[PDB]
Structure 1
Amino acid sequence: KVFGRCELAAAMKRHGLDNYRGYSLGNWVCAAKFESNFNTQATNRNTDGSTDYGILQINSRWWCNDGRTPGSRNLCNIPCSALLSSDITASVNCAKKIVSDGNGMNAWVAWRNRCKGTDVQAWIRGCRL
């Protein structure tokens, strides 16, 4: 599913991401924009043999099981395919664990390089939230 911007903002907020670990909703919407272009089905292979999955590009070396990643830990205890669903529940709940792991949102490279330090509230402007 390709979410609309405000549609994703509302779903993220309903699932408790607004201000989760101190990161405002616009941070999460910006992250999803540049990680996946709001597409739940996005997948991208990495050099270490892992793959990133879903709207927040969650990695199969640490967080989910895809059956083909050396050194897999599956800390979210889910198949990586669960992170591709139109229902973002599993991606949100796993993202909560990731962002709590110690490095905050720096775990998302696109957030670090394209959202951190910018006017992230722009990503929720116009939305009825």
Structure 2
Amino acid sequence: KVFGRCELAAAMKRHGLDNYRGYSLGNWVCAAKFESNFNTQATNRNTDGSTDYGILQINSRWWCNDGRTPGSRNLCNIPCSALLSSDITASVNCAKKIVSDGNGMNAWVAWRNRCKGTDVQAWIRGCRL
């Protein structure tokens, strides 16, 4: 499913992401925008043989199991295909674990390069939240 901007912001807020570990909702919407263009079905393969999955492009080496990444840790304890559902609950629960592990949102390269230090509140402007 390809979310709308305000639609996605509302689903993320409902799932407890607004100000989670200090990160306002605009940050999470901005990161979803540049990681996946709001598409829950997005997948991207990396040179190390790992693959990123879903609206927040979560990586198979550490966080989920896709059956084809050697040395994978499956820290969110889910199949990576669960991260592609139109229901974003699995992605949000896993992202909560990722953002909590010490490096905050710098774990997402697109966020670091395209959202960090910008006016991220523009991503929720105009939405009925």
**TM-score of the two chains, using structure 2 as the length reference:** 1.00
Cα offsets for 1:33-68 (capped at 9, x unmatched): 000000000000001100000000000000000000
Once residues 112 and 127 of structure 2 are traced to their aligned partners in structure 1, the CA distance between those partners, rounded to angstroms, is 24
Corresponding pairs, count: 129
Alignment gaps of 5+ in structure 1: none
Once residues 52 and 103 of structure 1 are traced to their aligned partners in structure 2, the CA distance between those partners, rounded to angstroms, is 18
Once residues 51 and 112 of structure 1 are traced to their aligned partners in structure 2, the CA distance between those partners, rounded to angstroms, is 19
Once residues 71 and 106 of structure 1 are traced to their aligned partners in structure 2, the CA distance between those partners, rounded to angstroms, is 23
Once residues 30 and 69 of structure 1 are traced to their aligned partners in structure 2, the CA distance between those partners, rounded to angstroms, is 28
Q: Give every structure 1 segment of 4 or more consecutive aligned residues whose post-TM-superposition deviation is greater than 3 Å.
A: none
Once residues 25 and 85 of structure 1 are traced to their aligned partners in structure 2, the CA distance between those partners, rounded to angstroms, is 21
RMSD over aligned Cα atoms = 0.3
Once residues 64 and 36 of structure 2 are traced to their aligned partners in structure 1, the CA distance between those partners, rounded to angstroms, is 17
Percentage identity across paired residues of the two chains: 100
Once residues 57 and 83 of structure 1 are traced to their aligned partners in structure 2, the CA distance between those partners, rounded to angstroms, is 9
Alignment gaps of 5+ in structure 2: none
SS at match of 1:98: helix
Shift of 1:118: 0.2
Shift of 1:70: 1.3
Shift of 1:114: 0.2
Once residues 46 and 15 of structure 1 are traced to their aligned partners in structure 2, the CA distance between those partners, rounded to angstroms, is 29
